Structure 1
Amino acid sequence: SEFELRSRYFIMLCDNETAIAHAKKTSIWAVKKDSSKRISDAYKKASVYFIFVAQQTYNALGYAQVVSDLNSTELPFWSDSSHAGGVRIKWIKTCNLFSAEISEIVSHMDHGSEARDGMEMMYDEGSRLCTLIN
């Protein structure tokens, strides 16, 4: 890649139409409090990608590089008390793609059960998902 080290990858389960549509236009995402510390820690040590999939269906909506650390005062309008702060993103792919393999990876991402929003995935999973979304 353009990077020295492997990237780290996080899943964003999208259940808010305004949010995802706005993020594709403004290149900012609101990071949930449960997952923010891990994401911020990761951003300090590695290139970080967010992989965005639709909740339940697991259609792939795109993937983006995270290009700023968590900022408690730079948040999109649609954020709420569930969020810690905002991060800027750089979209690599934007799409609306159903793939059985994408869905299977997301369905088994948490020790063989369905992905938890904001979780870090394994390298094999993130790299495969970005390959499938390219």
Structure 2
Amino acid sequence: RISMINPRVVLDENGISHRSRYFIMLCDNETAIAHAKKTSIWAVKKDSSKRISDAYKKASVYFIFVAQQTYNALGYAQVVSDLNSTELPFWSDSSHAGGVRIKWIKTCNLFSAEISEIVSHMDHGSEARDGMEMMYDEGSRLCTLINYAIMKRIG
């Protein structure tokens, strides 16, 4: 099983790479995304914490940040620490299991129709669920689209 966009990337049964794994973060709080972009911390939901923590121990993990109401691209970051119940950001609530440190790769606030299309179909054809893992080809495409949109915006 080989990635459709990268012949050198082997995929598991789910279409997920063994080495690079991608999760979507759907944010509806300007204060939370602004805080995360300044302090490089994110809060992980209890519902997706086990799969995200297991991925952190096995591979490189990236969060792709998308606005809930618009699907605006907000950036993407590598997760660089495991879940910690004592380092939760101030905006977290009872639905969060713990915080993770992140390392921002790109940060923006823009719209891409191509990005919105991918997020709109990420749940096997339906709208993405917050915290879900995506396929390798979706994460690779989204990161490239963010890089390309940032690139074109500076011009």
TM-score, length-scaled by structure 2: 0.82
Paired residue for 2:75?
62
Aligned equivalents of 2:105 and 2:138: distance in 1? 17
Deviation at 1:67? 0.2
Segments of 4+ moved more than 2 angstroms: none
Q: Does 1:29 align with 2:42?
A: yes
CA distance in 1, matches of 2:104, 2:82: 16
Give the C-alpha shift of residue 58 in structure 1. Answer: 0.4
The Cα offsets for residues 15-40 of structure 1, whole Å up to 9 and x where unpaired, read as: 01110110000000000110101000
Which 5+ residue runs of structure 2 have no aligned equivalent? 1-16, 148-155
Matched residues, percent identical?
98
Give the Cα separation in 1 of the matches to 2:92 and 2:126. Answer: 28
Q: Secondary structure at the match of 1:40?
A: helix
Q: Deviations over 1:53-99 (max 9, x none)?
A: 00031000000000000001111111111100000000000001200
Partners of 1:116 and 1:56 lie apart in 2 by: 13
Residues of 2 paired with 1:67 and 1:120: CA distance?
Answer: 17
Distance 1:64 1:8 in 2: 12
Unaligned runs of 5+ in 1: none
Q: What is the alpha-carbon distance in structure 1 between the residues aligned to residue 65 and residue 88 of structure 2?
A: 18
1:6 positional shift: 3.0
How far did 1:114 drift? Answer: 0.2
In 2: Cα distance, 1:5 partner to 1:120 partner: 13
Q: Helix, strand or coil: the match of 2:42? A: strand
Query: Does the residue aligned with 1:77 lie in a helix, a strand or coil?
Result: coil
Q: For 1:48, what is the secondary structure of its paired residue? A: strand
Structure 1 residue matching 2:49: 3-state secondary structure:
helix
Q: CA deviation at 1:5?
A: 5.6
- Mapped to 2, the partners of 1:7 and 1:17 lie a distance apart of 28
Instruction: Report the count of equivalent residues.
Output: 131
In 2, distance between residues paired with 1:94 and 1:110?
24
Deviation at 1:113, TM superposition (A): 0.2
- 1:126 maps to 139
